[PDB]
Amino acid sequence: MPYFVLLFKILIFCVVAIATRGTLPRYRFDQFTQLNWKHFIYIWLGFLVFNLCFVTFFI
Amino acid sequence: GFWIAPLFVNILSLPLYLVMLVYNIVCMLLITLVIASITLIERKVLSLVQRRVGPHYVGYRGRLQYIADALKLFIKGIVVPEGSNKFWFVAIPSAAGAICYTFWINSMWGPSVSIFDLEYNLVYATILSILFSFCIMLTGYFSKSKYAFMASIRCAILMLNIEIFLGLLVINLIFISESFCFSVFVIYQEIIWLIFIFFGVSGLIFITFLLETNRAPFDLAEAESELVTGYSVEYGGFYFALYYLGEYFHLFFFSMVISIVLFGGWELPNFLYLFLLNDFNIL
Amino acid sequence: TNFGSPFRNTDSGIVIRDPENEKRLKLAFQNFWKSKQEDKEFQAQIKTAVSKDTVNFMFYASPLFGALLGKTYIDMFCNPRYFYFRAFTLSMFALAGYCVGNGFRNRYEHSLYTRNYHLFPKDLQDALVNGDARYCISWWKQ
Amino acid sequence: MLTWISFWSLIFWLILIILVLKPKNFISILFMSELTWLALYCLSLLFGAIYCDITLLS
Amino acid sequence: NTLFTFFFLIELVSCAIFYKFIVSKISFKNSNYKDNYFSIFSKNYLNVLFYQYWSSFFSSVMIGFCIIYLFSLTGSTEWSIINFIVASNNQINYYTNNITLLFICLTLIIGFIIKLGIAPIQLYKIEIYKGLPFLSIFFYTTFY
Amino acid sequence: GLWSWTINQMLTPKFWVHLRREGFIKTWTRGHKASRHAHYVGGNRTDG
Amino acid sequence: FCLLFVLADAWGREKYAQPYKSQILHGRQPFGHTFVQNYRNQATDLGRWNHNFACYEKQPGCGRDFD
Amino acid sequence: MNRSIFQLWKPESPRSNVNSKQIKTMNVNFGPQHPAAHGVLRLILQLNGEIAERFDPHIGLLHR
Amino acid sequence: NLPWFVRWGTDVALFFIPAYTFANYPTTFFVFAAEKRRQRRRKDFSDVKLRDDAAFSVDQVKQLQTKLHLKQ
Amino acid sequence: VGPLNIVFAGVAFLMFYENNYKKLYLNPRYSYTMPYLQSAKITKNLYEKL
Amino acid sequence: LQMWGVGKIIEIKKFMKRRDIELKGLQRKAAPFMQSMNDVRHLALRERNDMLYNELLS
Amino acid sequence: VNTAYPTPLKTILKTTPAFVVYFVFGLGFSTVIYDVVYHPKDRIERFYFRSSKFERLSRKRDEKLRHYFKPAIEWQPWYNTSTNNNTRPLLRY
Amino acid sequence: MGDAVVIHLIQNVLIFGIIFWLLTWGAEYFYTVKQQLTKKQFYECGFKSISELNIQINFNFFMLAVFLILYDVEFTFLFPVLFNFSMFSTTELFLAFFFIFLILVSLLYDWLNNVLSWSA
Amino acid sequence: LKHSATVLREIKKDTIMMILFIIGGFTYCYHMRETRFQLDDDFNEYVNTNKQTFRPIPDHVKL
Amino acid sequence: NNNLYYILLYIFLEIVFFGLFLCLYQLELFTGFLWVAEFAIVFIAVVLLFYLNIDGLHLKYNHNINNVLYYTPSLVLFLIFFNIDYFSELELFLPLELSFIDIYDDYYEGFNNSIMNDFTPLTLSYYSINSAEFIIIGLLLLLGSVACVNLYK
Amino acid sequence: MNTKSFEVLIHSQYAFDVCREQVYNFEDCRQTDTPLPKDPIHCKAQAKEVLSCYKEAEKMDPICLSSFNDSRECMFKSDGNLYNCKTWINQYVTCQKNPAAFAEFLEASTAEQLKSKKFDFVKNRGHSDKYL
Amino acid sequence: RVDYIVTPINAVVSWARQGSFWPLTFGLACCAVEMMHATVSRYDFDRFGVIFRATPRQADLILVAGTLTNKMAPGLRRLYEQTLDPKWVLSMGSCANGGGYYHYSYSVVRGCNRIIPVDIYVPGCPPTAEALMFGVLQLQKSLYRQINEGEKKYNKKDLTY
C-alpha cells in the first residue's frame, strides 16, 4: 500500500525537523511577527496572485 | 421466545460498542508507540548531530529509552501548589491529553483509507491545533507564575502569526486541490510533487513546517534559555509527559500533512525520470 | 505513463500485464493500416494535429538544440575542469531535449489514433477503446 | 422539544434581553455581542435551510 | 433596491461615522496654566465612542433580524416586489398571521428609531452631541 | 538484551574465527561484556 | 505586470477557436448558472432549454446523445 | 519609513496618571536557579510587556 | 570475503522485504477468507435470470469454461 | 421502594417491551437494525428479509 | 517552475475532464432506467397516501 | 583485510534500530486502520464526497429504499411505536 | 465534518484517558511524599514569589490581534471564490482582483502607519 | 561594492542568460498551451464519433 | 455568573452547542467555518482577559434585586405573547411513513451536474448576485482598518 | 424491481442501445421548459414501458455470466465507478449483444486474461482519476 | 499474597527510575563547569540517560555543583523541597562537599549537608568528568538496588511477610 511511502516521507520530514531544531537558533518574537507582518504575508499573496494569473493564462 | 427476544436489543448492541472502543484503544496504543519511536529517533538524531553516541545503555544498545521515559514519567508524583486553583490545574492536563489523542481521527493512510469520512480534514486539523494552543495558554495562565505567563503570552503571539500563515498556505494549496479532503492533493500530485509549483515558496513552506511543529526558529513557548521551561514551568510528571506527547503527535501529524500535500503524498516520485517518462500509451 | 491511454485508465484497480494481447493488437493495427495504405482517398481522409515531417524534425532536432544549449550554459558559468559537473549538465540538457521530442511524437501518434478514430472498423475501434485484442481477431490471428 | 424556528427566535430574543441583564462590564458586553452575532448567523443558516434561498445562506 | 444593500450601505455609513468620531482631537491649545502638574480625566470621547458603538450594534442586530424575517415571508427583499406581495396578502389572505407582521414592523421601526436616535431613546443622542466638535456636530446633523 | 552481535557484524571472517576459537558463549558474551559499538564488536578491522 | 500579461494573452486568444477562446472573455459555467443567467434574457436569445439535456437550444452541441 | 518616536517613548510627568506606568509591573526575577542567569545572579528586572524597564542585579550570591 | 556494500545489503533487505510484504498484505492470514468471500460474491447461473433465446446452454457454458480453463 | 416507584418501573418496562416488540416483530426487515437478532447473511436481490 | 506546474495542472485537469465526459456519456446511457424506477416508486407511494387522505378527509 | 563500512556510513547507521522501530510501529498502526476499514465493508469504500452527484445517487439508492421506502410502503396504523423513539426523517428539520 | 462516530471516538478517547489515570494511580502507589514548608509554593527560581494573582501584561499586540481578525475574515471571504475557481468568469476575476487589491492596500496602510511594531 | 571588470562581465552574462531563459520559458508555455488545445480537439473528435444524434425538444415545452 | 473567565468558557460551550445544532441540521460547512472563526475570536478574547482581567475578581453585583424587580415579570410577559411561528410543525406531528419526497431522485439532473463542492451556492452568491455586497464589505473592512489605526494613534 | 444498484446499472447499460423506443418516449415525456423536472405522475405510461423493457432485457445469455461477475466485482471494488470498469462493461455488453461472437473472442483468450480479475483500487490507482 | 507481582513490579520500577535519572540544570562554579563538560559529546551522559531538566518540579537528580553561601542556602532548601519526589542528591566538588578552600570563610555555608540532605558526594575539586560519571553510575546503581533492599523478612513459604 502507499502507506509505506507516506511513512518514509513523513520520517524524512521528521528527520529534517529534528536537524533544524539541532542547528538553527531561536529568533525574537517581535522580529518573527514583523517578518510575518511585513514580508511573508505579502510574498504569499504575490505568489497566489501570480498563480491566479498563470491559471488564467492556461485556462 | 417470541416475548423474550425483544428485551435484548440494546443488550446485544452493547458488545458492538465495546468492540469499537477496544479498536479505538488499540489504535491509540499504536499511536502512542509511534510517538515514542519518534521521540527516540529525535534523541538519536540530536546525539548524532552533536557528535554524541546518545542513549545506548537503555536495554540492548539503548533500544527501549522511550518506554523507560514513559514509565518514569508515570512514576514521579505531582503536587498542585496551594496558590493555584486545583480544578483548573488538573483540568488543563486532562483536556490537553484528550485533545492530543484526537489527532489520530483526522488522518488518512491511503485512498479512502480513513477512520471517518471527514471532508474537512484541514478544518479538523486547524481546530485541533487551536485547541492545543488554547490548552497551552491556559496551562501557562493557571500556573500563576510570571515565567509561565510570559511563556503563554509568547505562545499566543506565535499562534496569531501561525494561524495567518497556515491559512494563507492552505488557501494557496487549496487553489489546486479545490477540496478540503487530503486525498485530492495526492490525486493530482502523481505527476510531480506539489513543491515544484511552490519552488520559490520553498523557504516559506519550510518556515510553516517549522512553525506548525513548534520547532526552531519558531521554538517559542519552550524558551529553554529565555524563559526556562515552557508552559510546564510548574507542571511536571504526567502533565509534562502529556504535553510532550501531544507536541510529538502534532509534529508527526503536521509532517504527514506536509508530505500528503506538498511532497507528492504517498505516490512514488517520478519527477527524476520525467525526461524518460511517457505521457500517453497510444496502443 | 503520466496520463496513460486516452481511451481507458492505465490500471484502475487491477493491473493488466499481458504482453501477448498488446502485441496482437499492435500487429492488428499495423495490418489495418497496411490494408488501406495505398488508398489515396483514405490517405487524404487521415488528418493529424501534427504533420509527420514536423514531428520527425522535432524528434530529431530537439536533442541537438538541447545539447547545444547545455554546452553554451557550461561555457557561460561552469569551469571546464569539472568533468563530472559538465557531463551531468550536458546529459540533463540532452535528456530534456529527448523528452520534448518524445512528447511531440506521442502527441502526433495520439492525434493520428484519435482524429482518425472515426475511420476505424467497429471491432478495431472496440479494441482501441478497450485495449483488448479479443475484439478483432481476424486482423491479428492471421 | 420546541420547533427549531421557535427555539431560534426565542433564543435570539432572550440573548438580546440577557445582554442587559448582567452587570455593566465592557468585556462582558463584547462577549455577549459576539454570542448574539453567532446566534444571528445560526438563525440565518436555519432560515436558509427552511426556505432554500441562496441569499439567506450568503 | 433591496433591504440587503440598504443594510450594507447603512452599516458602511455607521462605520464611517464612528471613524469620523474617532478623528476628534483629544487635546487643544489652551491658556490654562494652572493645570500643568495635575491630571484632568475627561471621559467625553470615551462615552461618545461607547454609546455610538453599542447603539450601532443593537441597530444592526435589529435590522439583520428584520431582513432575515422578511426574506422568509416572501422570498425576496427588493423594494417593489415586497410591496406587491404584501398588498397581495391583503387580497388573497394566504398569511393571516398578523402577529409575525406586527413583530417585523416593530423590529424595523425600533431599529430605525434607535439608529436615528428618535425619542424616547434620546439620552444616547443627547450624550453624543455633548462631546463632539461643532463641525463634527454639523456634519452628523447633515448626514442624519 | 538480544542480538549482541548483529548479522552484519556476524557476516565477517573475524566473527567466524572468534566463534570457532573462543566458542559461542564467549562470542556472545563479549557484546554483553564491553559493548562500545556494533561495528567495534571485537575490533574495527574485519580481517580478524 | 502578470495581470497585464494575462490580459494581453486573453485579448490575443481571440484568434484561437471558440473552445480555445479565453474563459475570461468567454464564460463557461455549470448548467444551473447557464439557465439562471440566460432565462428570459433578450440580449442573448438562447432559445428553449432542453430539460433532457439541461442546456439552451441555441447553445452549440446541445442534446448531442449516442446514436 | 515615517517617524515613530512617540510609539517608542513614554515619559512620566508630575502627578500625571496618564503619563505613569498604567500597568501592574511584572516584578519577575532572573533568580539563581535559571539556565541563563549563570547560577549566581538574581537580576530583579522590572519588565513591561516582556521588555525590561528597570534593572536591579542582586549579586554576591556566590561571594566566597 | 564480504564487501562493505555486500554486508550492508543484508540489513537493508531484512528491513525492506518483510516491510514490503506487510504493506502488500495488511490483512494477514485472512487473504484466503477474502478470496472465498469474493468467490461467493460471484453469482451462479441459478441466482440470475437467463434469456430463453441464449446461444449456449448452462451445460455448454460449463464445458466451454472447462475447456478454456478460465480461472474466474 | 414505593407505589409510585413501582408504577414508574412498570410503565418504563412496558414502554421498553412495546418499543422492542414493535421494532422486532412489526418492521420490514430490509435493513440491519437489530444486532445479534437480524441476520448477517449476504443478500443478492434488492429486498431481502433480515 | 511555477508556470510549468500551472500548465501541467491545467493539462491534468483537461484529461480528467475528458474522462468525466466519457463517464457522463455512460451515465446518460444509464439515466433512463433508474429514473423510471424512481418515478414508479414515487407514483406508487403517491397512490397509497392519496387513498389514505381521501378516506380520511371524506 | 578490513571490510568495515565508511566512517560517515557507520555514523549515519547508528540509528537503524530506532528507524526500524518507528517503521514497524507505523506499519502496525496503518495495518490496524486498514483492517478496521476493510473488515466491516469487505473493501475500502470510497467517500461519498469524492463521488459525483450521479455516483452518490446510485450508491445510496439501495440503502434508502431498504431503510425508508420499505417501511413507508407497508405502513400500518398500529405499526408506529407508542413512544417517540421512532426512526428520524431523512432530512432533520 | 464529524458525526456520532466521532462522538463515540471521543468517548473512547475519554476511556483511554481513564486507563491512563488508572496507570498513574498504580505508579503513584509506590511513592511516599513528606509535606514541606515550600512544597506547595510557587517555583520562582528559589525564592518566594512577590505576587499571587496580580500578574498583568502590557498587551502590546492589540493592533496585531485586530488586524489578524480582519485578515481572517478577508481570507474566509476569499476562500469560497477559490473553492470553485474552475468556473471563473470576467466578473469573478474582476471581483477577486478587487478583493486582493483591497487586502494589499489594507496591509500597506497598516505598514505605512508603523502599526505592525510593538509600542511602549 | 566596487566590483571588478570580470565580475561585471559575469553579471552581464548572467542577466542576459536570465532574460533568454525567461523568454524561452514563456515560449515553451505558449507551445504547451497550443499542444493542449490540439489534444483537446482530438479528444473531442474521438468522443463525438458516435454521439451525433440530435433529437429536437418536444413541442410540449413552451417558450 | 459574573466571572469573566467562566463567562468566556460558557460562551465557548454555547458556540460548540450551536455548531452541534448546525451539524444536526446537516450544514456542516458553515458549522466548521463558524467554529474556526469563534475559536480565533475566543483566543483573542482570552488574550484580552489576561490583559485586562488577570486577577479575575468580578464586581460585587447581586442578581436578586434586578431579577425580582423587573427582569422576571418582563421575561414572563415577553415569552407569554411572542409567537412568530406561523406554520412550523414538529417532526413527530405526522408519521414519517406518509412522507416520500426524500426518496425521489433526479437521475438526469445528476447526470447533468458537474458540481463536486458544496461551496457552489457560496460562490454564486458572494461572486455573481451579491457582488455589490461583497465590494461594500471590502470597502467597509478597509475603512474599519483605517479607523482602528487612527484609534490606536 | 428487485435488483441492486450495480446490477441494474449494468443491465441498463447493456440495454441502452436496445430500449431506444421506450427510452426516447420517456425522455420526450420528461421534457420541460425549465431544469426543474416534471411531476412523475405525468409520464406513468412511458415509465411503465421503460421498466417493462428493462425487465425484459435483464435476462442475459449464459456466456455473459462470467463477464457480469467480473463487472460486478469491478464496480464493487470501485464502489460503482463505471468509467474505471469500461473494458469489462464493454465486454459484457458485447457478450449480451452476441453470445456467439463473445464466445469466439473468449476462445482466443490469453494466459493472463484467463486468470481471475482481482481489482484493488488502493494498490492500483489508475491515471489522473477524478473519482478517487 | 501481594509481594509476588510487586517484586517484578519493583524491579521494573527500579529499571525505569534508573533509566530516567534526569539531572537538575542547576550549576554554580568550576565543579558545575566540569559537570557541563560531562554533558559534552565526549562524555555521553545520554548513554546512561541523564538529560538536564530546568524545572525542579520535573527533575529527579539534584546535581549540587558549586559553593553554597549565606545568600543561597534558603534558595537551595526551597529548591530541594520543590524537587518532585522521589529525589536523589549528588554534591560534586569540594565546595559542595565541605566548602573546600573556603571551609574557613565567613560567607560559606560550611557544608551542603547541613542545609539539604545529600545522598552522594564527589571528592575532586574540580572532580574529573570521569569522576562525575562514576559518581552518577554509583548513584544509579544504588537507586536501582535500594528499591528492593530485602527490608521485609521471608516467611516459611519463602514469601516476604
Ligand code: SF4
Ligand atoms: S570545590 Fe574546587 S572546583 Fe569546585 S567550586 Fe570549589 S574551588 Fe571550584
